[PDB]
Amino acid sequence: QDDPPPSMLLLDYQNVPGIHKVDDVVKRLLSLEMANQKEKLKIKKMQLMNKVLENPEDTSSLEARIVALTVKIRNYEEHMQKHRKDKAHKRFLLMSIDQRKKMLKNLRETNYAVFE
């Protein structure tokens, strides 16, 4: 499991200059400690795309869509581990898994090395 640091200085306040020169309060406020779950999802998606994909700009690609759906699948599994009686999120997770499997089949049929 990935361990995003709470002081990660999330992407919305990471590529701008002068982030490390401010005091600790500004960095703590702009870090993942004060962020929601969506910011952590964006950070995880960025980190996974930077290491698994070869062209991070190519978002429409099948591999990029597979990575994006895998992030959501992991998030839905984490939500399900807490909520047992939630049926809408279970349906969302199952249909996301089915869509990811269909895209994996299409990727295997189109480009085998990328699928592997």
Partner: protein, 49 residues
Amino acid sequence: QEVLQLQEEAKTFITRENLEARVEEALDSPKSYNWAITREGLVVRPQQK
């Protein structure tokens, strides 16, 4: 600009040193958010009373 805007606000935050001063200042500086409207669409405030 957001980082610079937050930099200015970081000076006025409440901390351990400023807790005693801020409590006394709040206890002596009341604030009111009440303001009414009119049919024309203009805001009115009761602070003029």
